Amino acid sequence: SEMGEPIHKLATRGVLFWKELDDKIFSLDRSKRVAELKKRRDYIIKKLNDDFQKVWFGRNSAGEPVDLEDMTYAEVVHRMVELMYVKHEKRWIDPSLKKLTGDFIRRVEERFTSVEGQPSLLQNYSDLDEPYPAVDRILAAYPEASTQLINAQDVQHFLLLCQRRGQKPVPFVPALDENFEYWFKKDSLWQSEDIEAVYGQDVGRTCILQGPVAAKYSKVIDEPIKDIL
Amino acid sequence: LAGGGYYNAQKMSDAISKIEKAIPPGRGITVNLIYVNPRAMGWQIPLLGRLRADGVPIEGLTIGAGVPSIEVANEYIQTLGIRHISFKPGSVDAIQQVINIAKANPTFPIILQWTGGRGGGHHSFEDFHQPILLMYSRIRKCSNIVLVAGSG
Amino acid sequence: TKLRKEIMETSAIRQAVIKETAIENKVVNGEDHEALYRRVITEPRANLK
Amino acid sequence: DVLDTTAQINAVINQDSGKMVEVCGTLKRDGKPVMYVTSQFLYRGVYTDYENTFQRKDEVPMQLHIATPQDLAVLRSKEWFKLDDQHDIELLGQTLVFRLQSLVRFKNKNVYSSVQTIGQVLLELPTKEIIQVASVDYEAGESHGNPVIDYL
Amino acid sequence: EMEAYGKFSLEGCVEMAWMMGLIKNHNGPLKGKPYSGWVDAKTGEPVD
Amino acid sequence: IAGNSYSWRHAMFTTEVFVQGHRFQTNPLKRLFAPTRGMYVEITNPDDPAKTVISVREPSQSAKLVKTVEIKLVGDNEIALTLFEGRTAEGGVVPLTFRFTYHPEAGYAPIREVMEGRNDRIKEFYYRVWFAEKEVPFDTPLTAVFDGGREIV
Structure with a gap:
């Protein structure tokens, strides 16, 4: 578990890879951890991208997986939206994550403005309600934001934003750092209760808890509980 | 009511007083608090206790993952006005704990929910049978205990 | 000296009134409301292309 | 003595302890008021009947000193400040007395649903005359404070 | 920047101030609350 | 006072939780029927449920035991919990x-309380006990001004 405790989960694709890391990564002392993550980086990145609750926040404009550090400012603001706002339901997974994406936007603004006085194109986070429409407009007023990658400083900033107190844990993985554990297995249940949120929306990569023996004793779905009892 | 999904004091006293109003008048509510989360469980307990004093229909408390200390339970019992208290032990000695908690208050309802190794999520390494097969006698010899089989 | 006064005087009044009516809004609407509705001017940073 | 007992409800607001009522009594004798017996009562418990909560306070007598055309220009620039057609005594040098009354209606114990302030702006002449140079009229709903009192 | 324009851009200041050792990048807690970005080398404080 | 018969009279002295709306409340009979220096409790028509009547008598201040509490039925299930205060505005025991x-x-909450009017009903009581x-x-x-009346000291 998060706390390090044993758990019984529906041995999904995700939960299986999670077990793998329990043994290959979370098995090693805090220190030697980062080292091993770098030797199996792209292997852990495939397994992330393919079948886990949380994806690798790494993709570029052309849909291919890259390093967070190789992303453009645009691609990042966009990828944040992609992974925290469910298109076909027109909702954010949580108002906080909207604020997140909104803040970083503001940041990308500041990075690309160089005279005082000019106000923000995102003056109220009410705009990100219907995001994908209005976001492109803001990103538009800052041309180069699509030309050049994240300033190494801003990467660090981004990463501290995904950890701030009073925010739903990020719905993905920002990098294989010293906190790769927190990134990976923090807040893993919620996704079983709302699979419309999940990447691709398959349970295949989700945490559903079950006894080993009470799994046979369930055969019909959607039975009223008044009945079962 | 799984209290372990209520991070905010407001959202818990909220969804709790939504239940009071959609219930067979007279029914009691039972909240389930996680013991290895003493941070969140810090506000949760005096929250329940405070609610009950206003009339809110909570007459049942359940402490999961870890068995409180004898005087830790004694507070819960005689502070928040609950009618029954439910512990989830997981080891042979965890049981004996509960028993003493019971001998502590020989006038109080103590639902001894017994779980086995094959439970969902957080699970001991114990077998269902041999712990109970070993303790049953002593458990019974305390009247306050409601031995409730669970798991599998 | 007359002209000196009138000019300084009217501007003083004008910008004083503004501060007044600005304060009035923080009272009536509350810190939170008035705060969250102010033009957010971005502070420049430097990117080394 | 023969005493005529008159009373009215100066405020009923629901604090946390319970709900409270302020009773202002006036004992009159020979047509003339002799002593006001105010009093507060507590219907103790939990209340959310904010639709009928309200208060008539007598705002603290306050002393505003106009000293600059800047000062005066603001005291006139106010919406709630209504100067009178008595005399055009330059309000410049002198100071003014603001004895106000007000009525507030609650909604949240934190946020006034609606507030009204009426008062009299006084000036004392060199001769010791007291004139109503103006008066105060302000009212708004959904207010967090009293913008008139604040200015003062 | 100097030879041509005659003074330092904000971009230039930060570059000089970096190599002169007046500011160094910090990334971790600073007086409790976390923080990243430029910091005054002398006074451990942050700098905009 | 509950007896062995599963009656309403048994549930009144058993459940400490009286339901009111969606609230619990401490069984007031616990405080009412707590032992006193010389209290009297009668159960008329004991084994005849619909006709059973429970009454209490405690010593007045300097006087012989007086009627204090009574419980009976009305309109089928509506139980009447009644209190009798001697000294009042009219010199007569008002209930x-x-x-x-x-x-x-x-079986868990066999007893509820009749809510509607409770406020008004009780206010009425006081009014009668204060001014008769x-x-x-x-x-x-409430804008109204209230007349207390002429008065000679």
């Missing part, structure tokens, strides 16, 4: 009563 439904349907007038100015606006 205050709380009404309770009783649905042995639900049973008719109590409800609809009078």
